[PDB]
Each structure stands twice: as structure tokens, then as C-alpha cells.
Design a protein around this ligand. Structure first.
Ligand SMILES: [Cl-]
Lengths: 173, 65
């Protein structure tokens, strides 16, 4: 659900996954670049399944480099000798400081990974369950970093002559 | 290239290409800028088209002093 556990061994399997993906992308660059251009066109100007994919993770290779920097940050953080607890904003602040990853592209990580796996036509999906777990972590920690808030508006702007107050429960405050 | 090399190259580039989302009048222009930054980092990291890339960085840095 909204919980994710990442073990050191899981991250080792993610590193294996990224190795595989990188070799596949190099092969496709040598054999069939059109598939990559088609994915790019879909991401920047076409069908997805709101906000545009951030320009830092549009191409397959830029996104793979992004995932390597994320993985390396997370591996670094796990070299503790005692329990550590911190807020999502502190984790993201360390991420930005150490490997230059910002919160917004993190939001897109799971979808971008699903697109990349579909584009490389990788048939088996369980093969990449560790990397997907990392992508999910990236999305959850970025999306829900500031927790939730309740906003009560005394009336709806659409119908300003009636008393139709609105309660909003959502992220980002 | 190691990830450590990629990161140091990226930090150097971002010291020059240091604009944030609120520095662009439109999201489209911001995202194009982000993709341009990726192209520069990739070139410097993989030693590709180095002269034209560092030429580009010098021009950008002069225009954004
Ligand atoms: Cl954001």
C-alpha cells in the first residue's frame, strides 16, 4: 500500500536491474533507435497512463542515470550502525544535496519506469520487481512528503450566492 | 564513468545552469531547460562533442552573468 521496505539485498538486486536495463538501451541504440524516439514522443506529446513529465527524465538514458544516482544515495543512507528516523523532507533534502535529485522528478518515477519497461518490451515483469519497488518508494516519498491537510472554504466559488462550503482533504500542506 | 564522477560533473554544470522553475515564464521552457542540462552533463560525462558543449556552456554563462 503506502508502505515500502527496502533492504540492502533488495537494492543490490536493483543495481542488477539497472545494469540489465542499461545494456538493453545500448543494444537498442545500436539496433532500433526508433523505439526510443517513439517513447519520447509519447511522453512529451501524447498518450500516457495532468503535469508534463519533467525534462530531467524524458529520455531513457537520462532516466537511468537518475535512477543510478537515487540508488547510490539510498545505499549510502543504509550504511548506518544504529537506527535512524527522519522526516521525508529531510530525506529529500539530503537527496538534493548529495546527488542533485529534486522532489518533482521523483513524483514521476513509477510511471516513467513503467513506460521504460513497456518500451524495451521486457516481457517478464517480476524480473524487475526490486527496481519497481525503488521507483514506488521514490514516488511515495516525493508525493506525500509534507503529509496531509484540511482546508475548509466557506462557500463554493462556482455558486457564490448559496452556502455550499467545501472541505478539502489533500497533500502539500 | 562512475556515479561519483557523474555527480561531480553535474554539480559543476548546475553551478552555471542554476535557474529554478520560477525563473521561466512557462513550464514548457523550464522542462526544455532541464533537458538541455541533461544533454550537457551527458556530454561532459561520456566525453562526447566536448568542444561544442563547452562552447555552449561559455555562451550560456556569458548570457547569464
Ligand atoms: Cl514538487
Amino acid at each position: 500500500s503506502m508502505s515500502v521496505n527496502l533492504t540492502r539485498r533488495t537494492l543490490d538486486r536493483c543495481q542488477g536491474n539497472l545494469e540489465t536495463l542499461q545494456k538493453t538501451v545500448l543494444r537498442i541504440k545500436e539496433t532500433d533507435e526508433q523505439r526510443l524516439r517513439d517513447e519520447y514522443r509519447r511522453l512529451v506529446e501524447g498518450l500516457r497512463e495532468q503535469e508534463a513529465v519533467p525534462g530531467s527524465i524524458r529520455t531513457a538514458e537520462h532516466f537511468l542515470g537518475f535512477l543510478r544516482r537515487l540508488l547510490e544515495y539510498v545505499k549510502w543512507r543504509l550504511r548506518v550502525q544504529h537506527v535512524v528516523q527522519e522526516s521525508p523532507p529531510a530525506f529529500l533534502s539530503g537527496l538534493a544535496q548529495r546527488v542533485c535529485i529534486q522532489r518533482k522528478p521523483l513524483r514521476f518515477c513509477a510511471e516513467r519506469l513503467r513506460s521504460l519497461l513497456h518500451t524495451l518490451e521486457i516481457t517478464d515483469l517480476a524480473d524487475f520487481s526490486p527496481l519497481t519497488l525503488l521507483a514506488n518508494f521514490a514516488t511515495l516519498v516525493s508525493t506525500y512528503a509534507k503529509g496531509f491537510t484540511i482546508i475548509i472554504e466557506p462557500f463554493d466559488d462556482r455558486t457564490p450566492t448559496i452556502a455550499n462550503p467545501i472541505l478539502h482533504f489533500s497533500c502539500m500542506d | 564513468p562512475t556515479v561519483d564522477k557523474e555527480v561531480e560533473i553535474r554539480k559543476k554544470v548546475l553551478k552555471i545552469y542554476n535557474k529554478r522553475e520560477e525563473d521561466f515564464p512557462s513550464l514548457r521552457e523550464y522542462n526544455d531547460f532541464l533537458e538541455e542540462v541533461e544533454e550537457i552533463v551527458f556530454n561532459l560525462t561520456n566525453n562526447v562533442d566536448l568542444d561544442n558543449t563547452k562552447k555552449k556552456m561559455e555562451i550560456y554563462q556569458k548570457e547569464n552573468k
